[PDB]
Design an enzyme around this catalytic site. Structure first.
Site, short mmCIF file in Angstrom:
data_model
loop_
_atom_site.label_atom_id
_atom_site.label_comp_id
_atom_site.label_asym_id
_atom_site.label_seq_id
_atom_site.Cartn_x
_atom_site.Cartn_y
_atom_site.Cartn_z
N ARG A 47 -44.40 -6.87 -5.91
CA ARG A 47 -42.84 -6.52 -5.33
C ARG A 47 -42.88 -5.42 -4.34
O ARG A 47 -42.12 -5.33 -3.45
CB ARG A 47 -42.11 -6.10 -6.69
CG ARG A 47 -40.39 -5.89 -6.50
CD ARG A 47 -39.79 -6.51 -5.26
NE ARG A 47 -38.25 -5.97 -5.27
CZ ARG A 47 -38.08 -5.46 -4.18
NH1 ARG A 47 -38.88 -5.46 -3.06
NH2 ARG A 47 -36.93 -5.16 -3.85
N1 LIG Z 1 -35.00 -14.93 -1.56
C1 LIG Z 1 -36.17 -14.59 -1.89
N2 LIG Z 1 -37.21 -15.04 -0.86
C2 LIG Z 1 -38.23 -14.71 -1.39
N3 LIG Z 1 -38.87 -14.29 -2.43
C3 LIG Z 1 -38.05 -14.22 -3.46
C4 LIG Z 1 -36.65 -14.39 -3.25
N4 LIG Z 1 -35.99 -14.27 -4.19
C5 LIG Z 1 -36.89 -13.87 -5.43
N5 LIG Z 1 -37.99 -13.79 -4.75
C6 LIG Z 1 -39.44 -13.57 -5.60
O1 LIG Z 1 -39.25 -13.50 -6.98
C7 LIG Z 1 -39.24 -11.94 -7.39
C8 LIG Z 1 -38.46 -11.85 -8.52
O2 LIG Z 1 -37.17 -11.68 -7.83
P1 LIG Z 1 -36.01 -10.82 -8.75
O3 LIG Z 1 -34.76 -10.76 -8.15
O4 LIG Z 1 -36.70 -9.45 -9.10
O5 LIG Z 1 -35.89 -11.88 -10.14
P2 LIG Z 1 -35.10 -11.40 -11.63
O6 LIG Z 1 -33.88 -10.55 -11.20
O7 LIG Z 1 -34.85 -12.98 -11.74
O8 LIG Z 1 -36.07 -11.04 -12.37
C9 LIG Z 1 -39.31 -11.30 -6.11
O9 LIG Z 1 -39.95 -9.96 -6.16
C10 LIG Z 1 -39.85 -12.18 -5.05
O10 LIG Z 1 -41.25 -12.12 -4.84
#
Ligand SMILES: Nc1ncnc2c1ncn2[C@@H]1O[C@H](COP(=O)(O)OP(=O)(O)O)[C@@H](O)[C@H]1O
Ligand SMILES: Nc1ncnc2c1ncn2[C@@H]1O[C@H](COP(=O)(O)OP(=O)(O)OP(=O)(O)O)[C@@H](O)[C@H]1O
Ligand SMILES: Nc1ncnc2c1ncn2[C@@H]1O[C@H](COP(=O)(O)OP(=O)(O)O)[C@@H](O)[C@H]1O
Ligand SMILES: [Mg+2]
Lengths: 52, 509, 456, 177, 74, 50, 456, 74
Positions: free
Chosen positions: B374
């Site tokens: 991240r």
């Molecule tokens: N729109 C996106 N484009 C690229 N990678 C994404 C995107 N959305 C999520 N990811 C990937 O998935 C990971 C987890 O997203 P996150 O929003 O933190 O998930 P959650 O809230 O469901 O735990 C991100 O850090 C990234 O690596």
């Protein structure tokens, strides 16, 4: 070095027996200090008698 | 070797003994069952306080009811009996902290088990803590290098990041974490390795591999093996985390490995089911997410104002951090199981290790399709961030086309050249155990992959090519590698010197 | 008068009071030495109340004196909360001094009545193609973003904050309930750097906290949004993980003496969800538009916490681990995402017909998965082969690069209007782009960018 | 549950009645006679018989105790026996005595010693303990040949160890470590 | 040796010390012992039926569903 | 090898001084010579520390 | 002082003691006038201990006097246990008089400490060629053993007993957890007729015994193996089923009323596995190496009983019906057996290159056997036919005559060293013996015995 | 040549639990005197159901499929 401490161990174990009766007196004068004047006679006998 | 006067220490101990009476708050054991002891009395005991039993056995008070105190034994319970005395200590559960634990193997309460004498720590600190808040954090941008090409090129770890290592059994999770520990021996980052539920011969082999590669003096080892009590297996990650938080709170940088958080959750499940607490998914307690989330939040990067507030003005203008690498074991690739999905919802990315790539000989075994960081390139150095933009796309074009090599002579030019570049990048990311690479050597290999100097070289001679190139740059261009190894800088001078050295290697060697 | 602590089991503390001075349900109490706040849950009889601490309980003993405050937990409200970070008790945690409020409100109140409810179906354009296509939003409406671990929930909310901030001029309340402390620091420094911090009030009770704080922090953020709604304004309310309120009610449930319900949950699950969710609505005085992230345990949608959460919402966006494992972001399952604004008397016949045709083509593609896996595409019929080709072009065109995902890829973000989304998916469904390859439809904004990507 | 958990509201109700009606020594003698009568083996065999009702068990206990019970103590015996709580009758009496010790501001202290202590030594330890605990104290002296000197004070959960056996254990822990 | 029932509270027991008779409280009246999660446990109400309305102060009404030996759950 | 020489040697010194300290406590027979005249002194200092 | 029985519910017996003489956890108790032994599990309070009877409780009453022994269950140890059958209490169950032991040891002790670990990855030579080539054993290691019945498990166990007794001057202990009485009598007479009875101590905990006997019988056999390790020897310990040890723990935990864990198991499953497996190690005095046969419930490897067992195992040996139908003994699958010692840091590069070359040639022969089965021998090339000839020579050289199987084969047995195994399989893999026929490679020792077999 | 032992479905669960042991004792008469016997237990599953009924009504602690911990020993 293990062979060297095997030679040194008997002489330091014979040196430690002259100090343990003083060690019990040094602990016993802290635990009860009201009999420090009598104990100078008591240590001439029972320094043998509690070690054996 | 042994004079007789040096054993006069006993007399000095007699001169520092306090024989005055001190008041204690005492109780009596009523019942002992499965590591849980009920105690009458102890009317001044606090929640979380150590309780002293005879024989040097301690416990921790969990259930302060109105007429009894329930305690969990922090050790072997089998010598405890009804009628024996219990004492308050005045102390919420503590471990010794300091630089004196570096080089030592301890248990979960900080007592040494390596046979190298007593630990002369000058400070203790509490095991249970709340992590510092929102305003006291700083965003992560300094690098932690693991020394692996695939990890430092694709999934970069920074100071203060939590990065999970997850996968099946016996495919190299301890190996990646121990080599990340060994690569910190000249970087200034101190190390903590917590083993939970492992075998003792595995722990002794790990500490022998730490001493054989020169990194034991930078590392505290905390061990709670597979035949200890489940209380010590539950409490050992928080004790090692307090040991890393000593270096976090004084403006220095530390790194901790929890080599199974999955066995800590099994031990906490055992303790909760013996207390007859009602379970949920997979018979785990309802607070099992809280069990991991109280721990991993403590790994953070804290600002200069927090460090200036903690040391009362002694350390000024420095941030501190604690990087965590937790490790989770899966069952047959199930990453949607309850504990693995709880720890993904907590960390800042994860590194998935795949069993099929391990069984085909791709030995660091990193699945590039689903591993992510991240923080990313905010933590990375400049030359590594510039040269690794084409690695993931070359591995992406290889995913489906790797099954096409049995008929690839009857394909178009772009598909054939994408598959050839995919085989070259896949053969570049293989790497042996206990062989770390610096910034300059991974930059040489990444420039040899990225700029098209692998194109006339066959697959079975890729990595031998890499080794020969590294040796040539160590004997001809050593000032260039010492320039790159300062802070990972990149400019046109470094670009031109690398490309001239690689062209002279491809022409004369 | 004062009581005495008689029992401490974890986060749950029993306090004995005199019999003419027993405190009420939801009354705040204070320990006399350490100043720990307790909140009363139950009256057990015999003078004894059972309460939940708003903080750490290590170091507390039986026999400590406890005062009662006479009222509930009251937080500052009004203009002074904007720009500021507060915890569950309303204390400031941003090192910026005291809050200069003029009034405080208790965090427990009833839902507004049936006669005070406000209807409305005015469309809210989000700039995201799958959200504007198959589950469109309304102003004054309620949005759930369902999904499992690491599928995107927070990235989608940050994009929805960034694009809903374009045509909105009122205030915002952001409540972090049981999520990452690093995400709170990043969002605060991002709003402080881009000078939008003075419109947004921040409440945080994160994963590092004891479960009383995580149990009660969303009530504090909702109380601040209710004060902004009852001043006659239009306000935005963002809650990252509402599932984490519910799980905090798991963690104290057996300590409160309750028998467990199915899969270990609390028996009062739907009532705690209803008492929280029925205060979020728009009224006739003012309006609240709310976006809530909703966690799905072990990727199981039939787990009781998301399954009770589904009927409290106007729009539901379900994310999928399989679609994200195909590389498609924002990873929305279009056959599982519904909204009540997808109705021909709200959005028109053309947009509705395009959305129903997209869902028909994706459903008939989903029914052919095992026969495509066993025998291949070659033994389908010709109209089936054409529908699989148009279905893969629809699945690639539903992805979109995001402005908040610029750090992950380096590709620039896109904003797509609703008209371009309807025209592009209509042109894919009619057969206007049957000569284009399918990888030209991947990660573009408009259909015209797919036309320029096809010539490369 | 524990015996003290069950025996708490009966002792609190008896203490609040005896403090409200100035009958503290009457209820202390009545609960002492009731505890000692309920621990005798013949009465304990009678109180476990399955064919007897609870009213007959309360009537047999009232007819055995006789003139040592006034009428509200007899009402208390019928309330204890109707809720099937007669085996709690020693524990109830003990908790009553603890409540009366908090009301008259006194504490019952057990002192064990290596040799016999005189009245001057007991008055000296009682005055030091009355200065520390801010209560009138009542000492109960006892002998132990395990101690080689000194006294051990036990007051509730408070233990003050002034014996030389404890100083010997401290010296053994200080030199072993 | 079971747990404490909801009528084992010391005003009720001290009441029975002052007068053993059940007619100290009327058969249509009771007193609230315990309040938790929408459940009110009441000592008394000796003539209540299953499903009968119970009047509380403040205009609040309840319904009795458990008619135990010593207590009423409403 | 020199670190293991010093660690072996320290384990021997710690074992010897542990058994000598365990022998000096067991010689408490001097404390067995006490009478009531020192017990009155011990009860005086138990008064002084309350 | 003695106690009295206050409660008998099944095999669970509660005994009341005086308050200053409550016996310890895991103390053995004796009922007066009867041949019944009890093992204390819990201390309930008020002098009452809750215990498990180590036999039938039919005919016991309340009021019987119970004596305490002052220690745990103590078994005879030393040279006098060899050749004898014993139960869990160490009493003889053959009709051959008392055991004339000089020492008795209690069956509960800790694991060896961190400073007592031997270090290194020293191999245990078995003398069997397929075991020392493909899946090598460690000293202090653990071996899972898989397969059904009738494929030569018992003959492999007697050959390991004979080889560790004659060639390495060590001993063996068998512990039958859940032993069928018919098969134990058969195994005893098979070890009398193969002259290996005096090399092994036998402990049976039979199937018709209550489950505390079947829980503690492996601890009894491990205590006798610990005495043999503390005489400076290298000991083998055989466990007949580890899943019956796990199931006896499930039954004993269900009798004590513990709340059960996931898929029905005991909540102390990993701890009760770890107390047994961490005592099987290599120490500074000697080593114990264990061979444990494993049953897998419902063919599920992700079931909690094999998932807890496979975390402790260092090697697996898989027995196959198809190798035994070809006449090749022992019937070890060279492709399905694994080892953690098969690693070039552990055993060196030369042994690893020879073993991975043999495994590649047998895997390529396994797929080419299906090619010959689908299309005939004329589909293969000259290099494919050369690999088929070398692979049949490798497959026949894996067979070996055994000293305990001389009735079966009609040949003298052979012990092969590890050096001769690596040199012989390297000589087949380099093409040095392509001029020999394949039937010379069947049932010999080293490669020189195959060379003198091909002159006859 | 056959002894038939019957414990039918309307009889007590104690008799259904004891019937296989009673039939085994009758068959063992012939084994202990050097003769040969053969016994059929037509449902051991129903004997386990009857023993589960006896163990649950005696408030013994349950396990998998609510069977007690000694059903393997049975
Ligand atoms: N729109 C996106 N484009 C690229 N990678 C994404 C995107 N959305 C999520 N990811 C990937 O998935 C990971 C987890 O997203 P996150 O929003 O933190 O998930 P959650 O809230 O469901 O735990 C991100 O850090 C990234 O690596
Ligand atoms: N890069 C590598 N190259 C070659 N072999 C490797 C590499 N990394 C690991 N291995 C080997 O893989 C095996 C398994 O590694 P390791 O013990 O670290 O796995 P694990 O997943 O941590 O297992 P455990 O279940 O014991 O925790 C080891 O024998 C090790 O030598
Ligand atoms: N080393 C061997 N050589 C020849 N035949 C063998 C060998 N091992 C086993 N067999 C054959 O396999 C059969 C089964 O062996 P055994 O070990 O008794 O299996 P189990 O113990 O499971 O019945 C034996 O009867 C024997 O004929
Ligand atoms: Mg998130």
């Amino acid at each position: 070095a293990q062979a060297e401490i095997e030679q040194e161990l008997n002489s330091v174990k014979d040196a430690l027996r002259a100090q343990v009766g003083a060690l019990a007196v040094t602990g016993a004068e802290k635990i009860l200090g009201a009999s420090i004047d009598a104990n100078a006679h008591e240590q001439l006998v029972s320094k043998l008698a509690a070690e054996i | 070797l042994n004079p007789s006067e040096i054993s006069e220490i006993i007399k000095g101990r007699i001169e520092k003994l306090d024989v005055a009476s001190q008041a204690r708050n005492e109780g009596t054991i009523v019942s002992v069952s499965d590591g849980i002891v009920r105690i009458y009395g102890l009317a001044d005991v606090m929640y979380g306080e150590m309780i002293e039993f005879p024989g040097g056995v301690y416990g921790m008070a969990l259930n302060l009811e109105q007429d009894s105190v329930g305690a969990v034994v922090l050790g072997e319970y089998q010598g405890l009996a009804e009628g024996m005395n219990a004492k308050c200590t005045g102390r919420i559960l503590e471990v010794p902290v300091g630089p004196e634990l570096l080089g030592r193997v301890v248990d979960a309460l900080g007592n040494p088990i390596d046979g190298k004498g007593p630990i002369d720590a000058k400070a203790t600190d509490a095991v249970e803590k709340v992590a510092p808040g929102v305003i006291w954090r700083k965003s992560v941008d300094q690098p932690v290098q693991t020394g692996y090409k695939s990890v430092d090129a694709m999934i970069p770890v920074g100071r203060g990041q939590r990065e999970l290592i997850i996968g099946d059994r016996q495919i190299g999770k301890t190996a990646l974490a121990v080599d990340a520990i060994i690569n910190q021996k000249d970087s200034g980052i101190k190390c903590v390795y917590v083993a939970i539920g492992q075998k003792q011969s595995t722990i002794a082999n790990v500490v022998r591999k730490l001493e054989e590669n020169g990194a034991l003096a930078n590392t505290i080892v905390v061990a709670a093996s597979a035949s200890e009590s489940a209380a010590l297996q539950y409490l050992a990650p928080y004790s090692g985390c307090t040991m890393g938080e000593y270096f976090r709170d004084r403006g220095e940088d530390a790194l901790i490995v929890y080599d199974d958080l999955s066995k800590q959750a099994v031990a906490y499940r055992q303790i909760s089911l013996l207390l007859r607490r009602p379970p949920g998914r997979e018979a785990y307690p309802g607070d099992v997410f809280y069990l991991h989330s109280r721990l991993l939040e403590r790994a953070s990067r804290v600002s200069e104002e927090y460090v200036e507030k903690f040391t009362n003005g002694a350390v000024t203008g420095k941030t501190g951090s604690l990087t965590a690498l937790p490790i989770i074991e899966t069952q047959a690739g199930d990453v949607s199981a309850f504990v693995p999905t709880n720890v993904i919802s907590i960390t800042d990315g994860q590194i998935f290790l795949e069993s099929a790539m391990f069984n085909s000989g791709i030995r660091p075994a990193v699945n590039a399709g689903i591993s992510v960081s991240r923080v990313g390139g905010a933590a990375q150095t400049k030359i590594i961030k510039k040269l690794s933009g084409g690695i993931r796309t070359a591995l992406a074009q290889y995913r489906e086309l790797a099954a096409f090599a049995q008929f690839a002579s009857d394909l178009d030019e772009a598909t054939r050249k994408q598959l050839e570049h995919g085989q070259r990048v896949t053969e570049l990311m293989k790497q042996k155990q206990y062989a770390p690479m610096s910034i300059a050597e991974m930059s040489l290999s990444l420039y040899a992959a990225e700029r098209g100097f692998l194109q006339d070289v066959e697959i079975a001679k890729v990595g031998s090519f890499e080794q020969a190139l590294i040796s040539y740059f160590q004997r001809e261009h050593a000032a260039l590698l010492a320039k790159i190894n300062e802070k990972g800088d990149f400019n046109d001078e470094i670009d031109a010197g690398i490309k001239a050295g690689i062209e002279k290697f491809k022409a004369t060697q | 008068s004062s009581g005495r602590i008689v029992q401490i089991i974890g986060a749950v503390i029993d306090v004995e009071f005199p019999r003419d001075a027993v405190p009420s349900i939801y009354e705040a109490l204070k320990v006399q030495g350490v100043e720990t706040t307790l909140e009363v849950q139950q009256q057990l009889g015999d003078g004894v109340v059972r309460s939940i601490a708003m903080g750490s309980t290590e170091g507390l003993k039986r026999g400590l004196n406890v005062d009662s405050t006479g009222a509930a937990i009251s937080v500052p409200v009004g203009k002074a909360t904007l720009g500021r970070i507060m915890d569950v008790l309303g204390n400031p945690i941003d090192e910026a001094g005291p809050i200069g409020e003029e009034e405080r409100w208790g965090i427990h109140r009833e839902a507004p009545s049936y006669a005070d409810q406000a209807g409305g179906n005015e469309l809210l354009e989000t700039g995201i193609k799958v959200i504007d296509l198959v589950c469109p939003f309304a102003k004054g409406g309620k949005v759930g973003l369902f999904g499992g671990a690491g599928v995107g929930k927070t990235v989608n909310m940050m994009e929805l904050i960034r694009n809903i901030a374009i045509e909105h001029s009122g205030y915002s309340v952001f409540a972090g309930v049981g999520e990452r402390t690093r995400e709170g620091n990043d969002f605060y420094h991002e709003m402080k750097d881009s000078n939008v911090l003075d419109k947004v009030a921040l409440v945080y009770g994160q994963m590092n906290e004891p479960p009383g704080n995580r149990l009660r922090v969303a009530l504090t953020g909702l109380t601040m949004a209710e004060k902004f709604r009852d001043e006659g304004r239009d306000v935005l309310l963002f809650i990252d993980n509402i599932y984490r309120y519910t799980l905090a009610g798991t963690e104290v449930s057996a300590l409160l003496g309750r028998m467990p319900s199915a899969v270990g949950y609390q028996p009062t699950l739907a009532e705690e969800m209803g008492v929280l969710q029925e205060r979020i609505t728009s009224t006739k005085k003012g309006s609240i538009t709310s976006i809530q992230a909703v966690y799905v345990p072990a990727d199981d949608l039939t787990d009781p916490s998301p399954a009770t959460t589904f009927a409290h919402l106007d729009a539901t966006v379900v994310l999928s681990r399989d679609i994200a494992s195909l590389g498609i972001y924002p990873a929305v399952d279009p056959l599982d995402s519904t909204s009540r604004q997808l109705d021909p008397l709200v959005i028109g016949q053309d947009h509705y017909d395009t959305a129903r045709g997209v869902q028909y083509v994706l459903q008939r593609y989903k029914e052919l998965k095992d026969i495509i896996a066993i025998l291949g595409m070659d033994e389908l019929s010709e109209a089936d082969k054409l529908l699989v080709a148009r279905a893969r072009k629809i699945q690639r065109f539903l992805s979109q690069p995001f402005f908040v995902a610029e750090v992950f890829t380096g590709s620039p973000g896109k904003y797509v209007s609703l008209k371009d989304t309807i025209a592009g998916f209509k042109g894919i469904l009619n057969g206007d782009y049957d000569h284009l390859p399918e990888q030209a439809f991947y990660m573009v904004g408009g259909i015209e960018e797919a036309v320029e990507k096809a010539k490369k | 549950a524990e015996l003290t958990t069950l025996a708490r509201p009966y002792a609190k109700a008896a203490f609040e009645y005896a403090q409200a009606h100035q009958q503290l020594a009457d209820w202390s003698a009545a609960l002492g006679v009731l505890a000692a009568v309920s621990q005798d083996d013949t009465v304990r065999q009678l109180l476990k018989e399955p064919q007897l009702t609870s009213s007959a068990k309360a009537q047999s206990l009232i007819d055995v105790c006789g003139d040592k019970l006034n009428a509200p103590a007899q009402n208390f015996v019928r309330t204890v026996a109707e809720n099937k709580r007669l085996e709690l009758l020693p524990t109830i009496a003990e908790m009553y005595e603890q409540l009366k010790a908090e009301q008259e501001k006194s504490v019952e202290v057990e002192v064990t010693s290596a040799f016999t202590l005189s009245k001057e030594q007991q008055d000296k330890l009682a005055k030091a303990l009355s200065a520390r605990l801010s209560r009138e104290v009542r000492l109960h002296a006892s002998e132990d040949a395990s101690l080689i000197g000194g006294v051990i004070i036990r007051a509730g959960d408070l233990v003050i160890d002034g014996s030389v056996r404890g100083k010997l254990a401290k010296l053994a822990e200080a030199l072993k470590s | 040796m079971q747990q404490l029932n909801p009528s084992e509270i010391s005003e009720i027991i001290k009441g029975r010390i002052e007068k053993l008779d059940v007619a100290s409280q009327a058969r249509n009246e009771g007193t609230i012992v315990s309040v938790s999660d929408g459940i009110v446990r009441i000592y008394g109400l000796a003539d209540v039926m299953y499903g009968e309305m119970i009047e509380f102060p403040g205009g609040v009404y309840g319904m009795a569903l458990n008619l135990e030996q010593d207590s009423v759950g409403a």
